[model samples]
Target: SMSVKKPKRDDSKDLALCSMILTEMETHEDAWPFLLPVNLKLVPGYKKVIKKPMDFSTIREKLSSGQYPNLETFALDVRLVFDNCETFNEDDSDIGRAGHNMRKYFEKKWTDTFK
Candidate 1:
């Protein structure tokens, strides 16, 4: 019988990648916008709802907690967050454009780093 051995995971590389993403996100503040307050009437209790923007602190916390299994997954998750942005009206909207740019930037970074 033959047994397959899994490759060792490198925590430092993962941490560095996560840090790079955080730094890039911070460098381009215009790409990600803060949540805006919206008026809503529901159940007679809720008055206003503000969309929460993605922040670095949360990503850093997740990275430190070992929430990501690999850099590929982390990159996908990061792109997914931007893909799920609801504050923008459409793909051509300002926020939407910014989100797209961010996703592309991260993708390029991922490819460059991996390659």
Candidate 2:
């Protein structure tokens, strides 16, 4: 007889982390300035999912709607913002610093929760 094994599914932590990241980004004082001009060009549905007059709300809506397949993909998209900024400015630039900070925040939060 042959047996089938099912894959484990645990998305509670992912949901929490996603929510936390979005909430922090939305509420941060510099969020508007930092996130407003961000163009997630490589993310799926860049043109179709996000609307004009981009802001936290629209970003949050797309993110929460499962734009990326998983947390790692979502994090990769977030990290891409910093990577692109690093191309134009030093890591110490205001935007670079903010992006780094946000990245670190997400990393720490994810690790703390998962590990």
Candidate 3:
């Protein structure tokens, strides 16, 4: 059920992005960020499911239990947010695209390492 793949630091890029954003947060602290880009059109009826509140314990239960009702549906929900950075921050600047490019660069390295 758990289609495990070799563990990769695919999350570091996102963490770096969050670090940059939180650098100005009033309650500044070390924050590790992990965001998923959900393709609404791809997920079908469950598109509304993500609107519900999410937390670490619940997400861990769902993921670790391995009873993912729909793998593709779920995967769509778990894409990195770098591709949709504008949605995360109200600043309508090219920073999101810039971040995407940077993330892609690192992602290429990670992918190559797997090969």
Q: Which one is best on TM-score? A: 1
The alpha-carbon lDDT assigned to residue 67 of candidate 2 equals 75
Clashing pairs in 2: none
How far residue 74's Cα lies from its native spot in candidate 1, in Å, is 1.4
In candidate 2, how many clashes are counted? 0
Measured with C-alpha atoms, the lDDT of residue 58 in candidate 3 is: 35
C-alpha RMSD in Å of predicted model 1 compared with the true structure: 5.5
Q: In model 1, which runs have C-alpha deviations exceeding 4 angstroms? A: 5-12, 34-56, 86-88
Model 3 has a clash total of 1
lDDT of 2 by residue, 1-115 (tens): 2587687778767866777877876676655445565556755445653343344555566677877577776666655555555554467778667666766776776677666
- Name the lDDT of candidate 3: 0.38
What TM-score do all the candidates reach, one by one? Answer: 0.64, 0.62, 0.29
Candidate 3, 34-60: lDDT as tens digits: 223344687564355445432223333
Q: TM-score of predicted model 2?
A: 0.62
**Where does candidate 3 have its weakest 10-residue lDDT segment?**
25-34
lDDT (Cα, 0-100) at 79 in candidate 3: 33
Clashing pairs in 1: none
Error of 3 at 1 (Å): 26
